[PDB]
Amino acid sequence: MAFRKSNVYLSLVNSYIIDSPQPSSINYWWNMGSLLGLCLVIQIVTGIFMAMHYSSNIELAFSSVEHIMRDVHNGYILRYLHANGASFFFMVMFMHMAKGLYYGSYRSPRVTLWNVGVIIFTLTIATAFLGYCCVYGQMSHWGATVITNLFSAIPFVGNDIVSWLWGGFSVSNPTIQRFFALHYLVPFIIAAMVIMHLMALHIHGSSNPLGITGNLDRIPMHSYFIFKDLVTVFLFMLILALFVFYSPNTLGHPDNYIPGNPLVTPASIVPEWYLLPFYAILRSIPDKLLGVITMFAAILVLLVLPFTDRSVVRGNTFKVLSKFFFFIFVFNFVLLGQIGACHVEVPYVLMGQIATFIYFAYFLIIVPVISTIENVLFYIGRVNK
Amino acid sequence: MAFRKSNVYLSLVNSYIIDSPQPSSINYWWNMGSLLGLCLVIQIVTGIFMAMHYSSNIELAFSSVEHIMRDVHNGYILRYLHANGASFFFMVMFMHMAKGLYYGSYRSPRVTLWNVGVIIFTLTIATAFLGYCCVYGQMSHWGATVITNLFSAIPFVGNDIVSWLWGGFSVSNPTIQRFFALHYLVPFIIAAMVIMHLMALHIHGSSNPLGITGNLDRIPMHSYFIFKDLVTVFLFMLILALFVFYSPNTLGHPDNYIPGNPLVTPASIVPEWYLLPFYAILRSIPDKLLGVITMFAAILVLLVLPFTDRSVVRGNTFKVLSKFFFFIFVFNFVLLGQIGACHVEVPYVLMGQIATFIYFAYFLIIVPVISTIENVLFYIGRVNK
Amino acid sequence: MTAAEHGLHAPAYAWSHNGPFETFDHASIRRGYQVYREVCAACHSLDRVAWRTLVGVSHTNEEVRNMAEEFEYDDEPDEQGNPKKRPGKLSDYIPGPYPNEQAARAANQGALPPDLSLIVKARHGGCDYIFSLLTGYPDEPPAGVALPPGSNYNPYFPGGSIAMARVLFDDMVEYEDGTPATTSQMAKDVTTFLNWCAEPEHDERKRLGLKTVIILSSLYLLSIWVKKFKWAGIKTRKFVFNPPK
Amino acid sequence: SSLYKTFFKRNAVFVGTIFAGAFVFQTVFDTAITSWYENHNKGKLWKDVKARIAA
Amino acid sequence: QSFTSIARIGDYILKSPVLSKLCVPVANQFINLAGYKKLGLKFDDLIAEENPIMQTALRRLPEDESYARAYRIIRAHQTELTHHLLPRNEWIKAQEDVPYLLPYILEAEAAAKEKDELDNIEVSK
Amino acid sequence: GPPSGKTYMGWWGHMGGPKQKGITSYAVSPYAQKPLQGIFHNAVFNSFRRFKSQFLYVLIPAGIYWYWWKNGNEYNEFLYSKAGREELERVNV
Amino acid sequence: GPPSGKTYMGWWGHMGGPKQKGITSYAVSPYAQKPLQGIFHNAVFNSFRRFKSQFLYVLIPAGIYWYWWKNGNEYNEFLYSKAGREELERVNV
Ligand code: HEM
Ligand code: HEM
Ligand code: HEM
Ligand code: HEM
Ligand code: HEM
Ligand SMILES: COc1c(O)c(C)c(C/C=C(\C)CC/C=C(\C)CC/C=C(/C)CC/C=C(\C)CC/C=C(\C)CCC=C(C)C)c(O)c1OC
């Protein structure tokens, strides 16, 4: 047989990237996964080269990043690629997830694929938080403070967890040095989880926009989707380039150009944009414990969709009510984020509490009810007895 | 079928660790590989927990390690495990390699297995050097200086490589910060190479002490070799424990408890013990370029053994001349190391040059000649015409 | 939130460095340094800017050397171990007015004048904000506003009450290049200078972006064409069904 | 097009020619862009400011 | 949701002429908006097949319907990838949009439900 | 080798689809086809179709949420102006 | 599935060995066997065998190298003592 098949290492490459049978009809929404692998590579490469110049001591961390910006040849390019790339990593992840939601990709037999995806998402959120703390600007210090304090809500042994996470009385040198060490580690665990993600993908193959079997018409990955991937790889790079060179600070927060100050929390504190919907959800609950429980539950409830989707067909392409409510969900999610960016003030507090309800009601109530109704509508529209 | 077989993740575990058919007769020399995986885990776990307390700035590095020794709860245990574990990692690697040499494990169809092994060995040597520099004691500074200077021997563009590796005029802050970043990275590349090593192992299975086929009598990995591995895992831990708690500095160098000084090279400078045979080989050549070429060649010549072993049977078990010369090789290697630990003085310089010759002559001359003779001896001792 | 608590939205001035193809105006940077030296430096440090970065940007190698040598920095101790000082060199960072935080608060009614190295990036509004703040002190506060003793009013500062008084007045500086040193001119200049302090890579960054965006644009348009070609057999493929007997 | 069939003659362009063309491109393109850029910003550059100072 | 259950609810609606006259027009309009007929599909072609009931059912389909489903599915993928719909004269008409796989599915669900019932029968003395 | 769980996808030659008979496909080399100056004239009144079907599913939820956002914002603005400080005292705590 | 290179090991049921016929094996449960106080009396004069065959292959190369080491060392010691400083001047450069 061909060497690409017979060799032990190359056959892996062949079965995943060259001869892998793809459904002929997958559209550009199926390009997001390769863009996520690319993102993971950009973050790791730029982070390692920056690590070469970075000091994690709480006295030196902010200045060591200014040193990367000012003194390291092309240092500002590395830092701006890393920071803007993290944002682009989330944009593309949301689209990858939204794609999965729309086309019923979470369904059997791809439940394991979906569950591993949810783990990667949690890990990616934790990784970006650890990195954000390493700058040690004002947003870094108070981000580290607020988020480590999430665990203080744990019954009896919560404040013990927090002081253990801090390595002392407050967010200090121990804290920032261990958060750098952890920020370096977790990207490699994400890489191992991506391999597990691709393993589960390989045994059943991709789904497609029709939601039905792809077995009757496959075309090889190589050529067709290699070069189709290339189209969105360049478009992705173009847009990332426009930010990195022309607008490098538009997606960040001006307060993180101020060194962290343990005695002063700025009035202008706002979470990173990709954390805003979740922040809003927590802020909507006027109780400490229940605030952090509900926020975590907003991530875990993604695990419930294979069971509450009662439909008998995969995906929303031929489903009028499901399409409509899907876009209610998406724009509700954007609202949650716009609420997160706002002050805790009259109209906003209520809107956030209602949007929070809509968020959970989608998975637990709307999808099971609507998919049942659509099941029955499909039936009585064709059966004549 | 059983779940351990049908599940996508568990079946990997099953085929490598549970149902994997082992030749019934492999002896305790085949326990070294699991001990190497264990070593890799000990180094990574203890390194990450120490990284949490370590500062890579050249002003702070030595004191930050003293801080781990003095102030971090159980910090001296982590540091002594890491340092002594690195040594134990080499002891076991040499035994794993020597096992391969003796039993013809490098032979067809396991050539790829052997070649990947040689890469891991190079990577492991580079990783330990990077770690040794991070202490920034006297041996750290001059080790970094001498070894980065290896590349200055490269025609025309050599001093350019060195100043690029240094990040300046000499071994300085840029150098130690990038060597820490690199020391953190390469263990994970070694982990990926170990997986590639186990992949090549899996398609042909282990060899055995008789050097013949194992296909007629296999027993499962699980139970038999899981619990047989456990025997040497505990013996390994016992001995490592005796060093870590009772004799933690016996395998290191007292000069590395002195902060690095760019103006003074101690008269007592000696390489780490596991680098001594290679050091001796370099020192035996009174030329700069040829010294570093010959030393690198002493590692690459391992790649030549599948071709210069002319024998028609795998392994040395039934080979009187090959057994004898194998032990000449081993004890010659120990001598090379004892020469490395000595002064560049009269008897020693010549002994080192002769031992160097014996080292290369083994692969290039002795093995091809002797294995040919043994081939013929086996024949004329039984054929009667 | 109330408009006073938010602060007045700073308007958009036509900065000559706004726009993808635009470098800083380096004459404005040169002038802005003078305004910093003669007005701002009395209260504001500039800790992250080293003398050498001025060379080839706003001043000559010679000019910067003279400027640095006007300041004393700690040197290495002599042969006997007693401390000693030293004129400044190009490797040194621009020194600040105060020795520590406590001395800076003492000289400013208890308030701390921030370092200005990053101030343009560390505020919403950027250049527009800094400029507007400096030129936006009214002679009297709006009616009803009771200002704390030692505070000043400025509508662009959040809450209106700022601990820095107006410091720019017409012709308090004699511009070395002849330019009329009006307050809005001086504001325009320091602000341009402070944008450079915060973003020294500005001119070069945009030049690299121009190349990067042209190459990537082309690669994008090219890959579309190559994809369509490689897919043409599949896209125009035709099926026929003849049901089997 | 017959401009292609004169140089490469119905065959694809080979890596060696591609690599060689890339080295040429890099230098030509950089000079073209720096020229346009410095010209577009005439007056504002340090080059231009130094022409009006002497001491 | 099982097809036995969809059939239960659907048939109840279809018989009672209160609901039957109220819902079926809604359902008819839902089916036209769905759009699958413009790709040349019948609804039963759309049922997710990666489970034992649907594999049993498809196995039991007569040859000629099987080859026809195969063509309709392949033709749907090709049209989808060209971002077109079929010529209108090629669309599936409502008379053709029959539940051809439904009887095989319902039969397999009943067989499966009985096995589950019999594997778990209690006994009383 | 080591065994294997049954899946719903195989590989070339045994993909796991149903037996195909009667379908005949035709295609033509990309090399023999018109260089890409075709689309347009034949295909631009064609597409811009698939979003006539879709735009309502996107636009109506978008509209609902944009209206709801604009309203709540303008209300907050009123509340914190002079005119609304009386209503602010009422709706606050 | 994805194809596969032919190797020299298969798996349980198709290991790739030759066809076996005529060989009959017997074994007895570990549970039914004497608790481990057996070895000794029956097996300690037994082992310590496999190193009667081997010790010469190890010992003779070891001997050669230990002798060679001891000799060179004692010579270096002589060279740097008073008695040997004359020989040192001779053999050095
Ligand atoms: C010289 C023209 C000059 C500049 C430029 C300047 C700017 C400036 C900014 C941008 C701030 C930060 C305001 C903010 O938080 O948004 C700031 C703050 C203070 N300054 Fe200043 N400053 C200039 C000059 C002077 C001079 C000469 C003095 C000392 C007499 C002075 C003082 C202060 C103080 C005090 C503050 C703190 C404001 C507060 O916290 O309320 N500045 N300045
Ligand atoms: C999935 C991968 C990663 C993500 C999502 C990520 C994300 C981030 C984020 C959000 C920041 C702060 C950006 C800012 O400056 O505002 C950051 C900082 C940093 N990261 Fe990462 N990171 C990743 C991997 C890595 C890796 C493997 C390293 C290697 C050491 C690394 C090293 C650093 C360093 C040195 C900083 C501080 C410099 C800076 O602020 O940009 N990162 N990271
Ligand atoms: C670093 C993160 C990730 C990487 C590199 C990655 C990569 C991939 C790749 C290459 C594909 C195939 C192509 C595609 O459909 O886009 C895929 C499919 C899929 N992924 Fe991910 N993924 C990531 C995160 C996630 C997350 C966060 C989820 C969901 C919570 C997820 C859910 C899925 C699903 C369900 C599919 C199958 C889609 C289908 O075929 O219909 N992935 N992923
Ligand atoms: C194959 C794996 C590794 C090997 C062989 C290795 C070896 C070494 C060696 C020889 C030293 C100097 C020991 C001494 O103090 O004398 C060292 C130091 C160090 N290593 Fe590693 N290392 C490995 C992995 C890691 C990893 C993944 C980390 C994670 C950051 C790490 C972090 C450190 C740190 C923080 C030091 C300085 C503390 C110390 O001196 O013990 N190492 N390593
Ligand atoms: C971190 C390093 C390594 C790991 C974790 C590792 C692990 C393993 C494992 C688990 C085995 C099977 C059990 C055994 O035979 O001991 C194996 C076999 C083998 N390894 Fe390694 N290995 C490492 C480095 C190397 C090196 C440095 C070489 C040679 C330069 C090498 C050569 C071989 C060969 C030839 C075999 C087959 C032996 C036979 O079956 O006769 N390995 N290794
Ligand atoms: C069936 O479905 C599929 C499908 O299977 C595939 C594969 C693709 C195509 C997409 C991909 C193959 C994505 C693949 C990518 C990954 C799995 C990446 C994993 C992540 C990593 C971070 C890689 C590891 C990297 C490193 C350790 C970095 C290396 C570091 C270096 C060189 C440091 C250098 C610096 C110095 C100083 C020495 C599809 O598109 C698809 O559907 C259409």
Ligand SMILES: COc1c(O)c(C)c(C/C=C(\C)CC/C=C(\C)CC/C=C(/C)CC/C=C(\C)CC/C=C(\C)CCC=C(C)C)c(O)c1OC
């Ligand atoms: C046919 O031959 C075989 C054979 O195949 C096998 C498998 C074995 C048995 C041996 C093995 C299975 C060895 C296996 C081990 C490995 C491949 C290990 C790879 C290396 C690693 C470093 C693992 C990855 C680890 C990490 C990333 C570390 C995790 C870090 C953590 C938890 C940090 C925690 C800390 C904080 C603060 C959160 C044999 O013995 C054998 O012959 C007899």
Ligand SMILES: C/C=C(C)/C=C/C=C/C(OC)[C@@H](C)[C@H](OC)[C@@H](C)CCc1oc2c(O)c(OC)cc(OC)c2c(=O)c1C
């Ligand atoms: C060693 C690792 C540790 C201890 C922690 C990892 C795990 C934690 C998380 O998920 C993995 C966590 C990031 C969480 O996930 C629920 C995110 C949605 C966080 C959302 C979040 O962000 C904020 C933020 O960014 C801020 O910045 C200025 C400030 C903030 O208050 C004002 C917040 C905040 O109030 C919340 C809820």
Ligand SMILES: C/C=C(C)/C=C/C=C/C(OC)[C@@H](C)[C@H](OC)[C@@H](C)CCc1oc2c(O)c(OC)cc(OC)c2c(=O)c1C
């Ligand atoms: C970014 C990574 C970089 C630049 C470098 C990695 C690659 C280099 C190596 O192999 C991978 C290298 C370690 C080499 O391998 C041939 C070893 C056998 C080194 C042997 C070695 O050690 C010494 C040592 O330890 C010392 O300490 C005090 C001092 C030394 O002089 C006195 C030496 C020395 O003279 C030699 C040859």
